[model samples]
Target chain A: GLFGAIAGFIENGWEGMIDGWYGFRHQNSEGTGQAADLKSTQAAIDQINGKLNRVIEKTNEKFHQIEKEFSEVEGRIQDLEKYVEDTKIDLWSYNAELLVALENQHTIDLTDSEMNKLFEKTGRQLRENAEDMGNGCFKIYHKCDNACIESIRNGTYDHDVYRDEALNNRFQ
Target chain B: PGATLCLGHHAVPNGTLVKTITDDQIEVTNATELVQSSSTGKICNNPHRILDGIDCTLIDALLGDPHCDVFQNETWDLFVERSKAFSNCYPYDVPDYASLRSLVASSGTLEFITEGFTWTGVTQNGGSNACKRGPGSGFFSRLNWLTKSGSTYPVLNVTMPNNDNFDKLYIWGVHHPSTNQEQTSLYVQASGRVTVSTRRSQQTIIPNIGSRPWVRQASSRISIYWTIVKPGDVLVINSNGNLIAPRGYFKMRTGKSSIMRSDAPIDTCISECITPNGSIPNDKPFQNVNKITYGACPKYVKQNTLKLATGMRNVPE
Candidate 1:
């Protein structure tokens, strides 16, 4: 059923283009066709397929134009994303700065590391930020391969730990 | 079944007899040594906590104490009062991986299992076992422990037996890294297809760790309802995997504390139990979550008269 829907679209495109040519041929004609003209009509419809093939060439030109336009914005989109993320971090740091100042005002000796983690956990915007935070924590805690930490915390399982004998090296 | 998980660590009483472990391969139980040496001229007492181990430290500092033994020599009521927000997440009652092994050895399923992990401080911070990955040898854990730096890490991978199946599973985890941008997550994969996956960064709020009243959580806790898992269906869990890590003290309460604690007995819910006098914060994230009440564990009237309580003989929740 899925394939049929797709195939029908291709068929319609072919038919639409050929019919387009048919409309062109009959555009200015006020003539009535007899049974004898039926053969010529068949010939015209037969040529419609190739006329539609030409239509595909025009379609490609339009597609390539769209692709070129999309490419121009692609880098801009990426830049905008980076700008938004940077702004988010800036605001978050400002908030943390205020919170730390409040803590200081009250004489709470909350460590910057602790405060940063609080911000990351509560303010970090995307998974990328979350992963950065996770990786930072993993590096300090295990003092070993943070790959395993990244894989495990995020559920990617990208880190291969089966051969990890270094994990127990410390006890020795 | 679902709402109670938000209460955090539903601890069992200390010194409760689980099962006599004989599997010498497992590290924690082998040290239990019923006779200190099976007949030596010495005797001993055993001890343990969950993420609450962190709260124990936190409350100590808050109360202006330099040490963390805030509950020793104190009554159960004091334990409740001093536990504060950390009460629900404490580890004293939740079983360890080794303890859960006992459950697997007999019942073949945890029914309800709650556990947690924490980082050891640096050598300068007075800890040598900070970074590691394994069964944690009983006390120090790699279960769900992730720190703010890259020095330490622990990841867990569990593969279920081919013949096993499960009706329900509620897993709660917490990730409070220094920056609000920090992140942690739980990944559940069944049959080579990732069945459940989420990130703390993706959440609107971090759920259970928030202060009361506005602290509502229902769909927040990680729950996998009724799935007929077959052999080779592996379950893998990791913490702070993006590896960016949390800053400062990454330790807190039980991973289960990320959710609510249940009122069911440890036999049913299988988490730690605590004294009931303390304040259980009203942190329900929504009024109705997963088609049930969203507040803390509530008293219900089950027709034909059913009741749920955590303590078996006398202890409480």
Candidate 2:
């Protein structure tokens, strides 16, 4: 009877130890699953942040490059404008010199009013006949002095030649 | 009288019977009264006799003496040959110098009236005045006081006449002392209202007067629009200290020169010697004054010499 009682106590104790070990294993498995989920989520968020930062830096660099290029282009345009202005001044100077030579020769026969009109007409013609070379320069078709002298000597210099034909007709 | 009537390029033989003579019509005997007589016409037949018929003195009076040589001593054939080559007298419109001269005399309206003005100031060294001078001396006398007081500077005023015939003004012979830096300005006033103002500065740095003595600073001609200038209109000129002086000439012209038009709107005034605070402070005479005569220099002298040398080399001696 004593042997049978001792066997029952040992079986009960073994069963209890097995139940405690199983419960502990189940809790540890649940905790490990939660930790793995948290770690994977944090890694994905960090990767997205890195990609966003790289994109912002690249965009900023591209913007600065474009701004610098635009500034360079603007400087070139200013230089071209200055060159054009200087060329125009040179052309005007040449025209003035030619006019002075003609005056000194005493060859033209016109009234003072007519002379003023002629001067204005020649200037306008010179400007109108200039051809743009598109490389910050202009090409003059005729030598202003020679042309003026020829027209005057030939008696073909019409002060009203520069007037619009349509307007002249309308007035008439 | 059996005289042939030469008209233009045609000729009418003498004793040709005439039918009617009216206000605007003159009828002759036959339909072929006028003949194309280029062969017999005086102008076309003998070009040598053309200058004999024309008063060359009158032409010389109308145009300058330079144009008279064109008709001087050449044969008619040679004249025709040479005139055709001339740029100014090309196309041979009348076939003879007489008719050409007549055409020029009839169509020409060019006339010039010379006006001279002198400026007298306190003589500095010997008989020389320190102030620089230009074209309109008495007319521009007010500008002798050159110092600027506040905004008011010495202004030379020229009033225009009311007459319509006074349409053009020519100014020349402006001479500066060529010793200092100065600015000359022109202001045009219409109806007592200043419309346009132009300025020019002489910044030429001359180290010593002995280096370039008797240098002409300003010798260019200036033209003004006398037509646009009314009776009350004024042309005002001002310099910092320079004044218009002796040996300057202005002309009122009836007709305009083509060359003048070519070089017009002389907006820049000639720069003259500058004065400190409107007065000459020093009396160190800049002189050794050489009497230099102004002469016409050839424009293409070098080119002409080169061409002449080339021709001489090519010609067989």
TM-score of each predicted structure versus truth: 0.17, 0.18
Chain A TM-score values, per prediction: 0.20, 0.20
Off by over 4 Å in 2: A1-172, B1-164, B172-177, B181-232, B245-317
Interface RMSD of 1: 39.0
Q: Interface root-mean-square deviation for each candidate?
A: 39.0, 56.2
TM-scores for chain B, in order? 0.22, 0.23
Per-residue lDDT of model 1, residues A1-172, tens digit only: 1222111111211122221211111101232111112222244334433333332221100000001111234466557655765564456334433432332222111111222333243223222212222312211112223443333323354223322432343233
Worst 10 residues of 2 chain B by lDDT: B306-315
Give candidates' CA RMSD values in order.
Answer: 40.7, 46.3
lDDT of 2 at A159: 36
For B1-317, candidate 2 gives per-residue lDDT tens digits of: 00010000011232122212121222111121111111111122121111221323433322222233444222211111111121111001112334433333232222443323222222211111222233222122211222234333333333323244343322211222222332222211111111221222111111111123331223221111111223333333322233221121122322211100011111222211111111111111110111110011011111111100000000011
Q: Would you list the C-alpha lDDT of every candidate in the order shown?
A: 0.22, 0.22
